């Protein structure tokens, strides 16, 4: 019997025509304004027409499927992609595991940190799917940022970029660690999310040559409601104002692929700020389908299966 690997991710439009139904799914049934759509289309057209996230996510899931199976002869994993706001939806993927006869599955979200607005939404949807059909049994991974190979991978990348900065200027360099912002209300109820990213920033900092680091947030929502701060653009200005850093190294470690939230929020917005103040901009490559990142996920999944009992 095969074991299902439910790999979950946010989803990205495949075509310009998908944008509206995508935006509406994101807005939970509320249809965006025609101008709103326009702006989103403009964003996607800034980064090069559409996001590579669709092909990256597939490489990541079928790369992990392959990596798990090539490293053992006890089980055969079958990977099923379940996106959040576009097809193949989470529910489509569970329905497929049922049809194919999967009895047990291990679900993983391509987002190392847990939050009530992200990972918890994925897992509730997949398990509500699994219960209506009566199969497969889904054993969910909730977070994997504490994985040593995960921390070492980012530290190695940051150190690669750092060595390419003049040593006389490395003391004027700062590492910005960030993730998707969320409505600050999550802290009222003890969400581990903000604390998990502080741990990720600390774990990495100890393993890099960059002498300074700060935690930031990106893609904050327009809701009048407060959101987790500071924003990476405001933090860059605040940091340059107090310390006059020459180099800014951005690591959006809450993400695992070069998609819109990285290519826009960092590679364009943060870069604008550094140019305005006169600082340099650095952004290490994201994990994407790199064999090291796939080995991180293979170890994450092979440990969940070992401790499944
Ligand atoms: C926690 C989190 C992650 C990380 C974990 C995970 O991966 O799940 C993430 C990832 C991503 N978010 C993405 C894109 C978008 N997120 C939006 C809107 C929102 N995201 C939110 C949360 C998150 N999002 C929230 C609270 C909203 C508010 C919507 C509402 O009003 O209820 C919107 C709408 C317009 C806008 O405001 O930007 C878009 C287009 C893409 C795809 C990029 C591409 O296509 O390449 C990716 C990987």
Numbering used by the authors: 3 to 311
What does the paper say about this structure?
Coproporphyrin ferrochelatases (CpfCs) are enzymes catalyzing the penultimate step in the coproporphyrin‐dependent (CPD) heme biosynthesis pathway, which is mainly utilized by monoderm bacteria. Here Fe2+ ion is incorporated into coproporphyrin III (cpIII) to give Fe3+‐coproheme, which is afterwards decarboxylated by the coproheme decarboxylase enzyme, finally yielding protoheme. A cleft, build by structural elements of both ferredoxin‐like domains, contains several conserved amino acid residues (distal H182 and E263; proximal Y12) and is the porphyrin binding site, where catalysis happens, as already shown for CpfC from Bacillus subtilis. Here, we present the first crystallographic structure of the CpfC from the representative monoderm pathogen Listeria monocytogenes bound to its physiological substrate, cpIII, together with the in‐solution data obtained by resonance Raman and UV–vis spectroscopy, for wild‐type ferrochelatase and variants, analyzing propionate interactions.
The structures of LmCpfC wild‐type (WT) and of the R45L variant were solved in complex with the natural substrate cpIII. The R45L variant was investigated since, lacking the H‐bonding with the propionate at position 6 (p6), highlights the importance of this propionate interaction in LmCpfC. 11 When bound to the enzyme, cpIII is distorted leading to a distinctly non‐planar geometry in both the wild‐type protein and the R45L variant. Some uncertainty remains on the detailed orientation of the carboxyl groups of the more flexible propionate p6 and p7 in the structure of cpIII‐LmCpfC R45L, due to weak electron densities. Nevertheless, the spatial orientation of the propionates towards the respective H‐bonding partners can be identified also in the R45L variant. The cpIII‐R45L (LmCpfC) crystal structure shows that, in the absence of the R45‐p6 H‐bond, the R29‐p7 H‐bond length changes from 2.9 Å in the WT to 5.9 Å in the R45L mutant. The similarity between the spectra of R29L and R45L can be rationalized considering the concomitant destabilizing effect on the R29‐p7 interaction by the R45L mutation, where the H‐bond with p6 has been eliminated. The crystallographic data suggest that p6 and p7 are coupled, and the RR in solution clearly indicate that an overall readjustment of the propionate H‐bonds occurs as well in both R45L and R29L variants.
